[PDB]
Amino acid sequence: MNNLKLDIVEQDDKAIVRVQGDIDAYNSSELKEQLRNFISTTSKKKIVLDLSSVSYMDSAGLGTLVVILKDAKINGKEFILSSLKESISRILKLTHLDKIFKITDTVEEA
Amino acid sequence: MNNLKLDIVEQDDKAIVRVQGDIDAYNSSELKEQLRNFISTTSKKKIVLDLSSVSYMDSAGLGTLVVILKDAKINGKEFILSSLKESISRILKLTHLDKIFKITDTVEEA
């Protein structure tokens, strides 16, 4: 159970979570619980995951993001994925998860 | 790494996979592996997962199903989820994965 570094910055109406590392079976449980806790103790209405440094995701990772999106909405927050690298934009289009996730080009746009 | 048993039946234009057990982190890799191989052998155009005995799915499980749908289509096949229990119907709705999966009420309807 390896990498996964979270750099969180809150400004405007956004809680920006810069994710370093890939989101896969080795750190998806860690990702879920950090986001879980953060969502419960932030005043911001939008939670933006800045994936600019994420190059890979596996099925465990996609499943975790899907449920985190749900947990966020349960909490009354908007969840957005921003600054995807082409490999991830690719994976989301192929699996049609782009029909579920709100996705912006840049974090500022969210 | 516990349960998971696949009862496969081919008839008509479809390959019916009766899944016994839960689709979770403990057997999602196995699930993906059997389906992968099956999808590569069968001549049926439709692959139907009869989930009537599946009571639970976790994030690893949902993520696996999403990529199996993808791999299925890659192989030119139709992938369908059928006979869901309400717990599962519930989860797919909450996560909005019902926007991705073709789901039928019964296996015969697929």
Curated annotation (Swiss-Prot), chains A, B:
It comes from the Bacteria. Residues 4-110 form the STAS domain. The keyword Transport does not apply. Phosphorylated on a serine residue. The modification Phosphoserine is found at S59. InterPro entries: Anti-sigma_ant (IPR003658), STAS_dom (IPR002645), STAS_dom_sf (IPR036513). Gene3D superfamilies: STAS domain. Belongs to the anti-sigma-factor antagonist family. This is Putative anti-sigma factor antagonist TM_1442.
